[model samples]
Target: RPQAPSDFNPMSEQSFRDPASICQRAREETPVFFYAPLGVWMVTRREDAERVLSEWETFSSLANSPNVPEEFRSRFAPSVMADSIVAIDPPRHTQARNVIQRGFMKPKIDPLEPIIEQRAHEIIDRFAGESGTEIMNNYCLELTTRTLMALYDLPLEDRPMFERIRDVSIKVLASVYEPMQEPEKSRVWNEYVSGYEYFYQLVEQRRNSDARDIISTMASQKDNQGNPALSTERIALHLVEIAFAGTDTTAQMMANAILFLDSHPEALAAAKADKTLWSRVFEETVRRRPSAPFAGRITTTEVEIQGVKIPAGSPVWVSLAAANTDPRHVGCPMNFDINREAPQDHLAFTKGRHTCPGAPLARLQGATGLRVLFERLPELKVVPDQPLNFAPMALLPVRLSLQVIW
Candidate 1:
């Protein structure tokens, strides 16, 4: 029998930090369950989660919630339309995604692999000889920011701005669902708004000039039908979303990857010996500690799963972390096995039409980052004295201290 609803509170810190236990219980008892705090239904089983993610028509991404403040809703509407292919229905989603898709083909991303490796080496060299380093604060986050900046042709000086915007946006968004006190939430909200203003200014500056940056390309590119291109507001949103979303999520993944290596020295050693294993290691890291554990969607029409009927307009939250850990889909789900032959099965990037557009970019960054870090600082290990603090939400790693010794 399914566990009682009272037994599970998805919003709790323990749940957020390590939802796998609860998710596994849900899957074992009832794959489809109601989560009251989120006001959404959840699918914990791997099969069901995959089905929901793949079948977008049945499960829509245009859900509304009172949790998101009005100001945030308004601020997000335009740019999210520009940034979120998942937010809108198909046809339009297909159209927008195609343009972005053209720019990020595998061939284009592959060549940049070497560049990413070089940058990782350069960045790691800076941290050499340091006794202890906050991996999240100093290494992973900064590397991700710099990489995205280079990928999108953004100025290096603007990297800090991007990081600030990402951090504030994440905090404010977390406040909507988590136990962020009013003062902290308000502070972050203000910071996010300020970041938006700065982004708007950047957009205005770009409009006046003809720069060859990604923002400029996005602003100027039109659909196949020869429309006037995306609006300035949309363009601005896309730029900011790309800048923040691409970097922050991958930063968390990097931190988790490092943590995993620290815990499993044998696996780390094997991966270092075989650089080709980097891809598998990356996939395993994502499966074990996904950055975005759950994806929220709304039902456009009534749907039935495992004989449970769900009405239209109901919110559906698919737990990616849980799904990835489902033994039915992935054998020995909890064990961090890096040599898994089919790593693509992991849904860390979601699936179907709304699969992350920046996935190729993210993969390149992760593989290069891991390979270079291991190659350069083979003797690097987590500092035994420092606490490894994971953030409440699975979205980020709050603190990771590492000691480098050679």
Candidate 2:
């Protein structure tokens, strides 16, 4: 068993929502600290976090535990881990990532940029003549939904399906830190399973018809031995993971970009004047408030840090939020400065082998969306008395009310 911090408070709710301060405090005391609530070790310092992420062999990705809430551990398993590329360690991880990367290469993403920009303009145009609108509900969500639709080549009428799948996935994933009551949790789980079943059925239909869509392509691709394509269950799970995870995370970044621009009118004017700053704005938003604030891993064997020994099979949580704020990694890490010389160093998408595979597509879509929104609506501002409320799980902005005008 691992030793716990003297002042450890397992039931502290504050650390769950805003862990940066907790991490900072821990880093001041020691680079590594034990989180009683998570029943795992936590790495707060920049060097320690980087070490764990870089050495995947010593730190395994298989962190499932009996202590983990059943709903979270089980639901995320086969779906996010077993089916997708993130669960495994290197070699296999690299192989799966290469396949996914080929499909999302810059050549493929570049062609889709115009489509993304057009969709952004189309969404903004709907509210162009209007005086004001709730940007999150009216524009940002639609922008993300339409981009995902085009990316997957789904029918335009299936927007509601995408919304439901994304929302349900967020709820299921959120249960990791904050498990809800049985009744509400069951309802969300039902919706989540229904969404997965619906997607699986669609995959079957697409496979039979051999439609020219992403799902069909992934289902038809062969492995190294030129055997049959990925299994239906695997393809379906991956589709759901990509569809939900991709949309919601980028949507939050887009919403945060709007909030940042609205609050800083001068920066907004500068971005409107140049338009090229959209990429910088997107990068800044991600650096400022990364959608996924933390990532978890398990130790394959015993490890030592700061003269403390951590036994084998111990789970470790890397505080990405804290690493991003470390002055050593990023100077002036808290300030949202678009002109930062090198923002790519931020851990928003992480680094090394496990870095997000969908980053290229996400950056393309996010940059395009921000560019089009600013170009079309130069007078976008937040509505009065409308406070920007971030989601509890740090997923995204739950409800961001913004007033847009030409």
Q: Per-prediction RMSD in angstroms?
A: 4.1, 4.7
TM-score of each: 0.83, 0.81
How far is 351's C-alpha from truth in model 1 (Å)? 1.2
Query: What clash pairs does model 2 have?
Result: none
How would you encode candidate 2's per-residue C-alpha lDDT over 1-406 as one tens digit per residue? 3444443332333443343544555565666777665567877667777888878889877663212235654543544445455567666666555545555666656778888877777777777887777777677778777877886788878878777888777666667656778788767776766676676776676664444356665655676786645556566666777887787677767777877787677777777778677788888877766767677888989999777788898888777777877876777766778888886777888777788767888888878887777777666666656543545443233444555544
Q: Counting only residues 3 or more apart in sequence or on different chains, how many pairs clash (N, Cα, C under 3 Å) in candidate 1? A: 0
Q: Model 1 misses residue 247 by how many Å? A: 2.2
lDDT values for all models: 0.71, 0.69
Q: Tens digit of lDDT per residue, candidate 1, span 1-406?
A: 1232443555555564455655776777778877664457888887888889989888877662214445566654534543444456677677666555654666556766776777777788887667656667577877788777776666777766676877765665555356577667666766766666665666566554444445544555655786635555555655656776787688878877887888899999999888788888888998887878888788888999878889898888888878999999878998888888788888888888888888888877888897788787788787666644555443343434444344
Q: Where in model 2 is the C-alpha error above 4 Å? A: 1-26, 64-81, 90-92, 174-213, 394-406
Per-model tally of clashing residue pairs: 0, 0
